[PDB]
Design a protein around this ligand. Sequence first.
Ligand SMILES: OC[C@H]1O[C@H](O)[C@@H](O)[C@@H](O)[C@@H]1O
Ligand SMILES: OC[C@H]1O[C@H](O)[C@@H](O)[C@@H](O)[C@@H]1O
Ligand SMILES: OC[C@H]1O[C@H](O)[C@@H](O)[C@@H](O)[C@@H]1O
Length: 362
Amino acid sequence: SLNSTGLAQAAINGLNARFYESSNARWSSDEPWWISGVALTMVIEYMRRSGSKEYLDQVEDVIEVQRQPLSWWPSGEGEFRADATDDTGWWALAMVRMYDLTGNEDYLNISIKDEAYMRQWWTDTECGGGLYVDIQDLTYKNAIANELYLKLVASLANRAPNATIYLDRAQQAWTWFLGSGMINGVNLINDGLARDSNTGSCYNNRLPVWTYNQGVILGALVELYHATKDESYLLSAQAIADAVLSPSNGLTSSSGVLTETCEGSDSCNQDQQVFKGVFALNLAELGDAVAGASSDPDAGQDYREYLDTNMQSMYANDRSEIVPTLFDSSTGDLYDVSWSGPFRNATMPKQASAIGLYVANI
Ligand SMILES: OC[C@H]1O[C@H](O)[C@@H](O)[C@@H](O)[C@@H]1O
Ligand SMILES: OC[C@H]1O[C@H](O)[C@@H](O)[C@@H](O)[C@@H]1O
Ligand SMILES: OC[C@H]1O[C@H](O)[C@@H](O)[C@@H](O)[C@@H]1O
């Protein structure tokens, strides 16, 4: 059988061999900065679930350089405060995991600065609540910036000294999210909200169902469960996960493999290429919480088998190896976007997603 710890570490090595820039303490400067945050999350999570510390020095290097004032958003004053609330949220959650890994309060402090910064763009005066994604524009309240925020405040309610302010925020933010209409009639989440021209009212914009918008929300509800021990949060999460797993909604193929809506047309762009592994990692958080919350030994079995089915398909059909040479002895695995379709080329977002799936299985 497959060793998910072995393959996660081979995929991180492939990630580093092809995409890490030592001079920049970052992966692929030609790819979006927020996806370096996701990749960092994936490496941190590998180390947490497996018990290894073989990438801790590198992670520390990336954090030290990427927490500097960003050259494209100096008014954020660094600490990952960026020109979009979702970019900030990806790094904030990575600093929550770093804290979980190390116990070092410095990482939790960054997460707390990031929550206060994102909150600046929460308004109650449009859509009854939620935050904007686009800090310079203030035109779009979307699913992912609001899921990241919700998962951040819920995480802080379990970890921060002023825990009860964060719990109140997370409970409010979840009430808002649920009432927004982004969760649609099959319990899947569309891309965001549109605003009515004459009336100011907000409604589900019916833009695509992206896998990472079915995933970050599960981590948030898991943290809400841990903050309250109220199983209602796990029941909502399981309804959203069960909808992804259902072939009738088209995110799961007849072969059982998680499939981005853009794959069929070979049109997944640099953002969409990372989406699936973010879902996988969050589905593993939900599986762990469900199985822990009950005495049934089959509890969470369906999520565990789903992740395992996907891992076997991705390893068998989507994987490629770096050619070792007489000089560069580096060894790792490389991955394309489709967890079932063929390997044609690796990119850093595709690779980060692949590590996510393996770490979900550790
Ligand atoms: O948004 C501004 C933009 O400028 C930088 O050069 C990049 O690294 C991006 O990922 C970032 O988002
Ligand atoms: O709600 C519709 C929404 O769709 C786009 O993808 C966004 O970039 C926004 O410009 C707009 O508000
Ligand atoms: O690629 C889809 C992705 O594009 C942009 O980053 C935003 O409109 C997000 O709301 C959306 O999920």
